[PDB]
Structure formats: C-alpha cells, structure tokens
Amino acid sequence: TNTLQVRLLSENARMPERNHKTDAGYDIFSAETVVLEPQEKAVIKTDVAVSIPEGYVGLLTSRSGVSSKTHLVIETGKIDAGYHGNLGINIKNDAIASNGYITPGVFDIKGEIDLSDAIRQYGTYQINEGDKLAQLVIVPIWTPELKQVEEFE
Amino acid sequence: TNTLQVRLLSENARMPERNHKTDAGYDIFSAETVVLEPQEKAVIKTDVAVSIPEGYVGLLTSRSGVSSKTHLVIETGKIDAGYHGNLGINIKNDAIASNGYITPGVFDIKGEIDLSDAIRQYGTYQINEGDKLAQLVIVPIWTPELKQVEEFESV
Ligand SMILES: [Mg+2]
Ligand SMILES: [Mg+2]
C-alpha cells in the first residue's frame, strides 16, 4: 500500500532519489548523452519503469535550479497507472540562435561552460548520462463516469 | 672564437635553445602575451639581445610546425652586426574574417582552440609568454665596395 515498484532497464539506469521523507518528489536521472542546439526537441530516456497504482497519476516535471538557470524547457509528462515502459523526459532547448555567434563550448545542466568536440551555435546544451534533470511527483485523481445533461445542477 | 654573446633583458626572457649541435638554428621565445584578430599585425618582443659578429647577418625566421598549422605569418628579419637592442618577431595573422562569425574561442600556436575572456572574430590567435615562435639562423655575408660601370666586365 505504501511501496512503489520500480524496474531498472539497463546498467545506465539509476534508482530515483529522495532527500527527506517529506519532500514532494523523487529526482530522476538521464540514462543518455544528448546534444541540443537552440530550438531542438527530444524525449530523453531514463531506462526506468514504474508501476503507478490505480487511483493516481505520476507527474514527470521540471526542477527549479535547472529551469531557472538554463533554457531547457520540460513539458510535464502525465504517467498513467499501468504504463510500464521506459520513462521519457520531454524537453526543448528554447534558446534562440544568434546569427554568426559560434563556440567550441557547450552549456551544461548547471549553466556552466565546458570545451566540447565541435564548433556549434552559441547556446547549445549538452545533457550528460547521470544528469539530475527531472523529478517524479505522484498525486491522487478523480476518475468519474460521464453523464451528458442539458442543464447543470 | 665560436661563441655568441647573449643578453637577457628581463625576467620574462628565455635563453635560446638548440637540440643538436648540427641544427641550423636556435629556437626563440616570446616574452609577452598578444591577441591578434584576423589581419592584425605586431612586432613581438623576446627580451633577448645578441651580438652578431662582423661579416655575418642573423636571420630571424619561422618554424615549420607553426607556419604550416596556423595562419601566423612571420616576415624574416635581417639582424645587422652591431644591432644590440631587443629582438622582435615581425608577425601577421593572415586569416580572413568570415562575415559575422564571432566567438569566445581563440586559437593557439599549435592550431588548437580554448575559451577566452571576450567575444571576438572567429579566427583570432592568442600568443602566450613562453611560446616557441621563431628561430635564429646566422649566415656569412659578402660586403664589397660598389663600382659603377658603363658595361660589365670580366673579374
Ligand atoms: Mg520559445
Ligand atoms: Mg593574405
């Protein structure tokens, strides 16, 4: 009744982490390395599956630090009870490219710069395997039957 | 007497270096840090002075690794016997600036790129204090009197 079943799908998967018992969510890790130039979109794999129980929905959503200090935008995933596949994080680099502004650096998930292997548009990001990118929050839901009516009351 | 006198003019000066007794030249080192955007020129100080003996000229000239893997072009200076001031390396960055393209990256003397403090044109080099930039080759010379003639004639 108070345990969530988890599957690790590969040697690159990491068990979800929680600091205190009272915290709202579990931190979720990237299982892959992905380069996002400005305005690029992707669904980044975690190699983790969970079993959300009947009567709830899982929310796969952003973190404060990452969203306020970078241009990486995560669209909140609604995880159905019974979805048992690989969790994916829905992301966009919403930076806008500037003309001829180029660099051998890439931004990381902390907003810091490191030297990379290529010349790219300034504002490109690199997500690394192991990056603490998103978090999982789980909340109760109402799932009623629908009744069509002509007037409410 | 087969010795060349050398003066070190500062704490940034490096004594010239040679590998092999048979090598043509002595490698020469930059005493300063210089940024050159495309088409930019400078004379770069070494803080070294030498006394070339009478009957010779010193040739301050490029190295194959530097000139073939970068756009840094060195014009061979001719050092007179009796020039005793600071030796300078006469250099141009002969990369061409490409439209916009700006960057925080700068290239070094090995052709590699690192990250810099400012935004500049793509193609900018940065030379560092201690870079092994040039060599010195010393050759003998003929310095005759001139005679004007109406027609040339056999010696
Ligand atoms: Mg936008
Ligand atoms: Mg030219």
From TrEMBL, chain A:
Keywords tagged on the record: Hydrolase, Metal-binding, Nucleotide metabolism
Record has Metal-binding as a keyword: yes
Cited CDD domains: trimeric_dUTPase (cd07557)
InterPro entries: dUTPase, dUTPase-like, dUTPase-like_sf, dUTPase_trimeric
Enzyme class: hydrolase
GO-annotated biological processes: dUMP biosynthetic process; dUTP catabolic process
One term of GO molecular function: dUTP diphosphatase activity
Ligand binding (Mg(2+)): D94
Every dUTPase-like domain range: 12-94, 99-153
SUPFAM superfamilies from the UniProt entry: dUTPase-like
Its EC number(s): 3.6.1.23
Domain of life: Viruses
A Pfam short name: dUTPase
Family label: Belongs to the dUTPase family.
UniProt cross-references to PANTHER family, sorted A to Z: DEOXYURIDINE 5'-TRIPHOSPHATE NUCLEOTIDOHYDROLASE
Protein name: dUTP diphosphatase
Source organism (scientific name): Staphylococcus phage phi11
